[PDB]
Amino acid sequence: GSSGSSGCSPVRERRLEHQLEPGDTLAGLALKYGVTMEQIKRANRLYTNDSIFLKKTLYIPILTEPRDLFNSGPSSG
Fold this sequence. Notes:
This protein is of the alpha+beta class. It is built from 2 helices and 2 strands, in the order βααβ. It is classed as structural genomics, unknown function.
């Protein structure tokens, strides 16, 4: 009766560093990935008196499901 500690906790939601450009629009990024402007903002409380451009880089919340035609596994590049 050998019992060990098995069971990892994989992440669900992550953030991607996007080199915000001077010619980018909130509505653009939202769709560009698959989210809603609000989400992104509320996610990084970007809501400020002045345009968001004030910043330099904005992170994007990646929403993916455990449902995939084929899963590679723990294998990493």
